[PDB]
Amino acid sequence: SPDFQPIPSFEECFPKSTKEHKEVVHEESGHVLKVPFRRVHLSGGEPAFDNYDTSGPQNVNAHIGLAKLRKEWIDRREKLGTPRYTQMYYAKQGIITEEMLYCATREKLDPEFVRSEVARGRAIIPSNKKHLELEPMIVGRKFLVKVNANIGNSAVASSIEEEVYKVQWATMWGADTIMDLSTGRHIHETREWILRNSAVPVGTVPIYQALEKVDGIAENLNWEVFRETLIEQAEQGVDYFTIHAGVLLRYIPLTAKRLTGIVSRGGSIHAKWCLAYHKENFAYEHWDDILDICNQYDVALSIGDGLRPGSIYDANDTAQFAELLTQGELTRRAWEKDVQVMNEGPGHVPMHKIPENMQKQLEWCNEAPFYTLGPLTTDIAPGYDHITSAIGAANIGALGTALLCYVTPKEHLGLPNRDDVKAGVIAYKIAAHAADLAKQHPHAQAWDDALSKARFEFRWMDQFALSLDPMTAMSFHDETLPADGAKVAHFCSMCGPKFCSMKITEDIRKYAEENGYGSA
Amino acid sequence: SPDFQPIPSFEECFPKSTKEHKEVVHEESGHVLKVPFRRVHLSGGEPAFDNYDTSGPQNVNAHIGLAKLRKEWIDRREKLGTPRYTQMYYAKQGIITEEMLYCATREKLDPEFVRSEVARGRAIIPSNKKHLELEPMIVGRKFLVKVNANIGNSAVASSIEEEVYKVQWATMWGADTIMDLSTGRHIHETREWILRNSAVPVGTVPIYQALEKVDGIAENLNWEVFRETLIEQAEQGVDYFTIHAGVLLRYIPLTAKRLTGIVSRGGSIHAKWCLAYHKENFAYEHWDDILDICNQYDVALSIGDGLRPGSIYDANDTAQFAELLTQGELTRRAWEKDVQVMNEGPGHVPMHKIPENMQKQLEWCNEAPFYTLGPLTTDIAPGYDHITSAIGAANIGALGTALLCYVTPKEHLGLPNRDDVKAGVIAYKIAAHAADLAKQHPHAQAWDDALSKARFEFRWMDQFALSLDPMTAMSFHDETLPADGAKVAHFCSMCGPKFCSMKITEDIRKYAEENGYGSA
Ligand SMILES: Nc1ncnc2c1ncn2[C@@H]1O[C@H](CSCC[C@H](N)C(=O)O)[C@@H](O)[C@H]1O
Ligand SMILES: Nc1ncnc2c1ncn2[C@@H]1O[C@H](CSCC[C@H](N)C(=O)O)[C@@H](O)[C@H]1O
Ligand SMILES: Nc1cncn1[C@@H]1O[C@H](COP(=O)(O)O)[C@@H](O)[C@H]1O
Ligand SMILES: Nc1cncn1[C@@H]1O[C@H](COP(=O)(O)O)[C@@H](O)[C@H]1O
Ligand code: SF4
């Protein structure tokens, strides 16, 4: 019974917003789905602006956990009977599931389009049947670009209470998925509390706990230990597993001349084991057995990039792309068993090398969703790697990357705290939305337009309410002009009343009203 | 006699760094030039790492001002006699000036290459002969990407003391130029203190003070008022003027259907005057007279973009590109009189629209240096516009933009303070360097490689010392591991000792020492 403390309220974080749900009926089952969104209430005769909402149910006691909203969906499918439980299996049968309709509604797209994307392997809906608390979401290039927030303890830092806070906090600010990457104490328990209290998909990297199960002795890992860890985590409801099955024995020497070696945590663990025994990666060898596990729960596979580059020097090297080729093989094998797959990508990559990454992944991995860690576009600014990587994430997102794993200001320096989690999520929501705009994703610009209209019209509170982080925008403005009257002033302190360009435009257009721009 | 207060010392900001100078001789004159750089002193047998340095002379009493290092250069050229005083004039005569050699040295490139770039109009060296305190620098696509920091008061906020602090502070963190954009009290005096204490080029937007000279009544502007303002500012040493001479009367109606209208401060002032009189822009009409002024001092012209887009909605519209076409005409006219020119660019531009901006500017403006305000890649995150725009700035920098005007976290909200200035400069140094890497600019990656080598080798203090902001990186690490011993630990709190991937790689390579990767 951890001493859980509440995050700041939705209302504190998003003034003028309300949580809403769109009700739709899943016709085959008759199940009524309540698909979340937020509504930003505006002034001056503007219609309210509806936006995406990952924050999940609010004010729920963490000792009790979230409502098991998917229970009737899972129970009905079990009673009907099925050989496999994955969204890809259902999609290939021509079945539109509750999860697919929920995602279609959430994305403002057709349910058949969702089904098609999942069936062809170009989108995934990470949704383990044991994660009944989940509000379904979809990851794929044809959908909104999504953001993952990484949390979890280490042996050096944090606690159960703080990690649960961090999941609620990450999702408040826009995280679409989270991963519990705990490598310290109480791994199982920490994850249980998180899953029961997470409305978003939860991923893990099972090799971390497997290594803990053998007391940090990598040589004592093997398939059997790993298999038991997979089943344990699947039973709790983990929606996706990062598995570094492309770190093949023969690829390891390709890293010998790298500047920063193997920087992947899981990748380095597999490499250590492979070298210790001179034997092929056991997750690769047992790929089919992993697929059998995934089929029973619907755990999606996030095929790791254990040989990703950890420095600009190492970007796009032979080791990295050898693994990418194998990720594609593993992807196609998974699809033969109807297991949902995404592929993990780099890393530290300078901007001119970003296009090659997307081109090769799209081709070699048959358009499976891509899931990048950034990339960081330069190594020079630890303390600011949310910015160095927002540049790369936005770029690779624009080229088609479906899920952007965040990077916080603590990257390369220490375990992120709750403040760093917020900073990382905001930077990544910026990158993801900038990518949506670059892709001309339907209706993405409506958000920018609503805020910009409020800006031009000096509807200051509306401007703040429409932004990613309303209280930051408001407090920043108020540092110089805190008075209530300034919230309707046609200027701010940047230019002052006589040099505000939008006020000058306002006067210009007023002058032009009577007959136009043609008279003195 | 303002109450000037010192910025934190170079040593506080950059532990393990020293300010150094490379001495070179200007052969025609015999003048000895002392070209600044910094040297980062490293451990473990690494050679010291030399980097660029804009911070200028340190610990100089602002009441006294900086040494007039260029005095002998200017005096000698005056004694020789010349019809025009610009670096472009000298370059076209085949003359390598002190300024050109200084820049060549600072860029590690050949002085003839610098001369060629300036002569052809593809680079500028903003260096008014009255700014004797200036350490010369070059702006151009063939050189390091540069950053401008905007400072200055408004009628609502700040003071002379604070603005001088901000210039010293901006340059400490890497600003390559600054602009004094004051629109409040004491404009002339504020600028005088800044120029006498600035080792970097100082730009202004003369129409702001011209409008102040006529008490904010735009209708009382005219060429004569503007001309007197130009001469006043030139006499003080302003190195470049933003002049919105492309805001033509006939382009103004093209803005009528824009979401955010005319967002340029200077552009809106010119538009108001043009509409008031139904007369062509007086700066356009008197372009030749402006060139005559610039020739006598070497003031470079930064041709404004008064019709830049101020929202994603307005990006790449007819008004914006009409002005760009005119900027090209004005550029070619300026070159006929040997006046140095750069062109100002957008703005708010979504990523997919960035390439068109560069393509049209390179063609229509004959490769003159481009100088962008960002661009911001989305409107959704006021409070974080240093990040929304770092993405655009890095992108457009990669495509060839030579000078990136910073955007601080206070953009759209209020006047930036000293903290915001630092945040903006750091974000922009990231964008500029990421662009240098993307362009494969010679030796740019050496910086990333040195930091990444320190990272892999757990030379923590070296890693911090090599970064853009050493004390931030150090303090962030120390939030979880503050002990001195942690500065040599082969892990940090992110992974802890047993999950650090670089330590695992370290052990892996140690194992492989005896004979290789082929044995169990
Ligand atoms: N407990 C945790 N909380 C938040 N992020 C974590 C985490 N454990 C691992 N991560 C993420 O996983 C990464 C692996 S450790 C270092 C990886 C390396 N910097 C690289 O370039 O890939 C971390 O840097 C962090 O981004
Ligand atoms: N005194 C000052 N200090 C710092 N930046 C200034 C400044 N005066 C003007 N600026 C810069 O010039 C801009 C003009 S005012 C608003 C411009 C608008 N946001 C746009 O998209 O172009 C400011 O936003 C700021 O970026
Ligand atoms: N998204 C991504 C791409 N490459 C790595 N990651 C993420 O990085 C984390 C740690 O992975 P690893 O064990 O490979 O270092 C996990 O969150 C994983 O999804
Ligand atoms: N670099 C740039 C490109 N477009 C505008 N700017 C900068 O924006 C500021 C204000 O310009 P304006 O008067 O056009 O709003 C000046 O610093 C100018 O160089
Ligand atoms: S004063 Fe300047 S920064 Fe403030 S609202 Fe007006 S145009 Fe924007």
Ligand code: SF4
């Ligand atoms: S513990 Fe993880 S984050 Fe820290 S130095 Fe090692 S690899 Fe990097």
Ligand SMILES: [Cl-]
């Ligand atoms: Cl690291």
Ligand SMILES: [Cl-]
């Ligand atoms: Cl604004």
Ligand SMILES: [Fe+2]
């Ligand atoms: Fe890294």
Ligand SMILES: [Fe+2]
């Ligand atoms: Fe703007």
